[PDB]
């Protein structure tokens with residue numbers, strides 16, 4: 001729009017609670033896909049988004065898995081003649097660090113909503129909390 | 141309409157095994173142990189026998205959902221080798237390709 | 242001159258020192274109140290302007306998953322607790338306190354505690370089934386020197 | 391000889407599309423996948439159910455747009471959303487397409503209990519990759 | 523037959539609303555102003571008094587409430603175009619930057635009526651204020667339906 005622009009765009013309401021926030025020491029995001037190029041683009045989108053929100057991120061490529069199975073090519077007899085099929089799974093792991101619970105929800109929502117088709121995520125949150133009040137003091 | 145009469149009989153076997161699962165579980169537990177009197181175990185062996193034969197879960201056969209083929213089926217997709225090959229060879233299965241190596 | 246908020250007013254009403262004294266739902270929503278609300282919604286009813294507004298509407302209606310993904314969204318097993326699922330020996334009080342029936346029911350309640358696919362209500366039904374089963378077999382048990390209830 | 395998904399040679403007068411021209415062994419090499427879901431990835435479930443929905447969704451779209459499909463449809467699942475991307479010939483009037491989209495979307499959203507959207511790209515005529 | 527009697531009657535309903543300890547709502551005032559659009563000549567002073575009382579009571583005027591005052595102060599079939607009223611300028615100043623929500627059934631009507639009044643006065647600066655109000659927040663949702671969206 002050249003001349004017609006919103007004036008005061010309405011923004012969602014974010015209210016700070018009185019409950020303490022979760023503290024994630026680590027947050028591993030393992031995305032899976034049949035296509036490496038999609039993982040490269042999603043890795044670029046996710047790493048850029050993390051750096052723009054202040055999150056610390058590292059990326060590595062877990063070894064790929066290929067599952068192969070054999071089938072009978074003909075409809076009837078001709079046993080020795082087979083056809084083989086495979087499914088290739090590729091992995092990209094986004095290891096985030098030192099995240100509060102508010103930062104991990106907004107980031108995960110943003111990147112999960114933009115997860116391309118054919119891509120599956122496996123978030124592995126690692127929360128850190130104090131010791132139970134009972135355990136703190138030995139009681140007989 | 142299901143594919144054939146063989147698929148219809150199997151469908152009924154699958155719905156009657158679901159109905160009698162709790163019953164056959166509770167009764168069969170009384171037999172798979174050595175802690176209860178053998179008189180009770182011999183009697184529970186007859187209560188399970190009296191249940192209808194289609195409740196028995198070993199009479200279910202995995203058939204192709206689209207052609208009702210009894211053998212040659214792949215359990216992850218529930219399709220026969222012939223039907224699976226038609227969808228796979230046309231690019232219609234997500235991520236399935238031919239294996240060249 | 243024609244000041245919108247400067248000048249004489251009707252003065253039939255007085256300043257509302259008391260405000261909204263009767264509650265808004267004085268009675269359960271009537272057809273008249275339920276329908277007027279639907280008409281107020283149509284006043285601001287405009288078509289979707291982009292894919293965001295469409296997804297916002299689907300989310301408000303439950304059609305689209307909420308994010309971040311929670312695999313247990315809306316999945317509460319009767320608001321139970323861990324101790325309810327794991328400690329099930331309270332329900333074995335009717336059974337004999339010792340003997341073969343106690344030894345068997347202990348194995349039954351041990352498995353039920355390790356069952357993640359059943360609710361507490363379903364687990365109790367398994368225990369109740371055996372209570373009625375052994376009651377029916379009172380005569381066979383008595384021959385074997387086992388006394389039930 | 392292999393007869394699977396191979397549009398065999400005629401006498402140079404048969405117009406095959408890009409998808410039809412390539413045999414099964416070119417999948418993941420020259421041509422991609424028509425459906426993209428996460429159900430065939432490693433350690434993922436519900437492959438059987440996603441595949442059955444695809445078979446139906448293709449037969450439904452052919453009958454709902456009879457003779458108006460220039461190429462096979464592309465199915466894209468994201469979260470619980472389903473997206474159907476179909477190349478459709480410009481045979482029917484414009485207003486008729488709005489009817490079939492509203493109908494086919496609502497009908498398939500109440501049948502599979504997901505949000506379903508239809509994406510139609512109109513072509514003047516079938517696109518010919520080569521004459522075989 | 524007589525407006526003075528008719529107006530005094532409608533006021534009597536309002537006086538019984540205070541005897542019975544019933545407090546008026548936005549719709550109550552909107553209804554009175556919509557009725558006043560019949561008597562353009564004699565409804566001007568009464569209409570302003572209503573809006574002053576609306577604020578004192580604590581009811582917040584909605585877009586519909588101004589839509590009715592505009593109709594009453596800027597008649598479409600206005601022969602006296604020589605010296606039009608200036609209230610439209612004051613209203614827009616009052617509503618500058620505010621965001622509005624659906625709270626009546628005539629909220630959509632306001633924007634289409636306001637733009638029309640700008641064309642009659644041939645004031646393009648006022649048209650920018652009206653459109654500028656439409657862009658603040660989500661006011662765009664109250665432009666109107668198909669008949670009034672294309673007129674605005």
Ligand SMILES: [Mg+2]
Nearest residue numbers: 198199200201
């Ligand atoms: Mg067998």
